[PDB]
Design a protein around this ligand. Structure first.
Ligand SMILES: Cc1cc2nc3c(=O)[nH]c(=O)nc-3n(C[C@H](O)[C@H](O)[C@H](O)COP(=O)(O)O)c2cc1C
Lengths: 166, 162
């Protein structure tokens, strides 16, 4: 099995279009500045201690800001957050500052922007930074937490956004 | 410096997950389990990670075999997900009996009728507290045009139209 080729990137992306993802906006703030981006490549690693990972495209050099600040917050998006998901995916242009202006943010522990009205927010300190081909994989220990009882979760699946009732 | 485990788990119930069954086969035996702690790492080369609890000793079988298939579940797969979660008993063989399986590249069981299946060779195994994190390169692929995805959210299964 070590000698066989990996599948084609296109075929893989097409298959991954069948793999739903809860839409997050991952954020950071600190000496390197404030940045956010719409993200689905994240998951929980452990509950003890609470640890989550995110995958950031290397091709966008501004993603280094997360590493430099050594903190990030994962904000789980709800029904009313389509505009924000679009802003933070680069769909509508705008500067980072202009993108943040579109909603109200607060903080938990690290200073990374936490979305008011998020389904959940996980505020993290970076504990591992890894290079995996096209992406940095950052592991974070969860040092701040919020959750709110919103009616719907924002989910990406089959190349479009969906709202799913909790 | 970290938050409480329970509070974290509770917050994570607001974080939806596409339900997968991850499987393996080889010299160490055949094993499957339901999970949502997986994501795509890269498309070049196609790479996926999975997180496996240490407490379930037999998860070592994935590491020993060095292959796994991630099967993305569709609408009709709720009972199957329940079986492979260990929450309704049954031996491994009894769990596999509840569905039809095939092979792609590695010999790991691939689910017939899955929305997608990603057949992987393990390229890295990492230890992270209570879990192993396995990185797999995708060497086999299947995809089917099923109408709904099985999603876990708010401690319940959901069906989401594609
Ligand atoms: C639904 C969706 C999911 C995304 N997931 C990720 C991700 O997992 N990791 C990542 O680095 N970028 C992801 N992106 C892309 C980033 O949002 C985007 O690269 C970032 O906002 C910077 O875009 P810009 O330079 O055009 O402003 C995703 C985009 C969308 C629309």
């Amino acid at each position: 099995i070590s000698s066989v080729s990996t599948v084609e990137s296109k075929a893989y992306r097409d298959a991954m279009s069948h793999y739903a993802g809860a839409v997050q906006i991952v954020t950071t703030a600190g000496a390197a500045g404030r940045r956010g981006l719409t993200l689905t490549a994240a998951c929980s690693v452990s509950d003890n201690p609470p640890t989550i990972l995110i995958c950031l495209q290397k091709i966008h050099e501004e993603n280094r800001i997360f590493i430099e600040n050594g903190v990030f917050a994962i904000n789980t998006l709800a029904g009313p957050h389509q505009q924000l998901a679009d802003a933070f995916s680069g769909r509508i242009g705008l500067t980072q500052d202009e993108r943040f202006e579109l909603a109200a943010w607060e903080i938990l522990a690290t200073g990374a922007p936490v979305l008011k009205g998020a389904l959940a927010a996980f505020d993290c300190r970076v504990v591992s930074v890894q290079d995996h081909s096209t992406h940095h994989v950052l592991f974070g220990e969860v040092v701040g937490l919020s959750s709110h009882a919103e009616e719907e979760a924002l989910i990406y699946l089959n190349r479009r956004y969906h709202k799913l009732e909790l």
